Write a protein that binds this ligand. Structure first.
Ligand SMILES: *[C@@H]1O[C@H](CO)[C@@H](O)[C@H](O)[C@H]1NC(C)=O
Ligand SMILES: *[C@@H]1O[C@H](CO)[C@@H](O)[C@H](O)[C@H]1NC(C)=O
Lengths: 55, 292
């Protein structure tokens, strides 16, 4: 289980960037790769009313 | 605004006492809706026929609506929905009105819908972009947006300061963009009102937040476009900026004496700003238009 946040000129987590990317319908993807493996895991779209960062 | 036009006048049969346009709105068809002295009126520009609106019983300050005109029945019925409200009214006791067909008939809209709300009413808006009805609700010095519909039903947006009142401009293409501006402030919303943020000004390639009241400038006019935004500040200043995602950047244009107490700016086309001033001719009583 991991908590991740978009980093801009503000290093601290920001509840505006999350709101922008969620109001556009955009959520991060994790790409796990190996010598012989490729896998993708999508962060579930959630309202940014409370969440300060992606989980 | 080519040629010269006589000023628009009330025929005087349906005397409306003082003739102050509190708001005007372009409904589908040849009709134009004015709120004169708290009463709705419809004017047909091809005729000179003025029609008072019977549905609105209590005084209203503003009429709000959204217009699409892709050639179809859809954008027509989208254009039909309208709201009539008194900006600044108490949250409880003010009566809001809705029109299902153009502006022709107005029906009062029921309170039970928003009891859970107390404070002044900055505005009631139909947000067809998000398929949502949003009310700008002012419960303190700060103001918020509340969305009546299921998802988010009664879901508050992030609060923004709101001393005094604000005028709200909706972008034509229903991209979701909004401009909230008054004399001492200008706020923009990339979102549909959920996040309301200050505009950033560029000076010598450094960007910084702009507070109109802080810099003491007083904005005299704003011109709004589908993708762009400009405003003219009373002390001969003109700012042009590109409103978009990731914030809005505004650059101050080179100096020019463009302010003359009757001037106003508007966007003729993408990339073409127009400064317009009515000059009065004593003999002919029809106004010339000085264009820049
Ligand atoms: C659904 O949305 C609410 C509103 O913030 C949130 O608190 C809740 O955790 C969400 N539920 C799920 C399962 O994501
Ligand atoms: C409205 O939303 C609230 C929470 O946002 C929810 O608890 C309620 O069930 C919803 N009711 C209707 C009628 O949509």
């Amino acid at each position: 289980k991991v908590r991740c946040f978009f980093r801009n000129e503000n290093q601290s987590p920001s509840k505006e960037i999350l709101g922008l990317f969620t109001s556009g319908g955009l959520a991060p993807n994790m790409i796990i790769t190996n010598s012989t493996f490729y896998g993708g895991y999508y962060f579930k779209l959630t309202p940014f009313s409370n969440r300060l960062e992606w989980l | 605004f080519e040629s010269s036009l006589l000023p628009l006048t009330v025929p005087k049969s349906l005397a409306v006492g003082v003739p102050s346009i509190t708001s005007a709105h372009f409904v589908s068809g040849s009709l134009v809706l004015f709120v004169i002295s708290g009463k709705g009126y419809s004017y047909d520009y091809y005729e000179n026929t003025w029609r008072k609106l019977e549905g609105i019983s209590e005084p209203v300050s503003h009429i709000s609506g959204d217009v699409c005109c892709f050639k179809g029945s859809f954008c027509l019925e989208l254009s039909n929905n309208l709201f009539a409200y008194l900006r600044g009214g108490q949250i409880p006791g003010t009566n809001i009105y809705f029109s299902d067909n153009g502006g022709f008939s107005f029906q009062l809209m029921n309170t039970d819908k928003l009891s859970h709300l107390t404070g002044t009413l900055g505005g009631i808006f139909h947000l067809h972009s998000m398929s949502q009805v949003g009310v700008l609700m002012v419960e303190n010095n700060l103001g918020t947006f509340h969305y009546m519909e299921y998802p988010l039903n009664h879901s508050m947006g992030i609060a923004f300061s709101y001393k005094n009142l604000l005028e709200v401009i909706m972008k034509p293409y229903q991209r979701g963009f909004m401009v909230l501006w008054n004399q001492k402030s200008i706020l923009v919303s990339s979102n549909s009102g959920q996040i309301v943020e200050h505009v950033r000004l560029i000076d010598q390639k450094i960007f910084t937040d702009l507070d109109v009241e802080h810099a003491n400038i007083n904005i005299y006019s704003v011109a709004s476009n589908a993708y762009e935004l400009a405003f003219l500040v009373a002390e001969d200043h003109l700012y042009y900026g590109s409103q978009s995602y990731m914030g809005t950047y505004v650059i101050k244009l080179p100096h020019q004496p463009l302010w003359s107490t009757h001037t106003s700016i508007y966007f003729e086309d993408i990339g073409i700003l127009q400064v317009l001033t009515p000059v009065a001719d004593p003999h002919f009583a029809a106004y010339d238009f000085d264009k820049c």
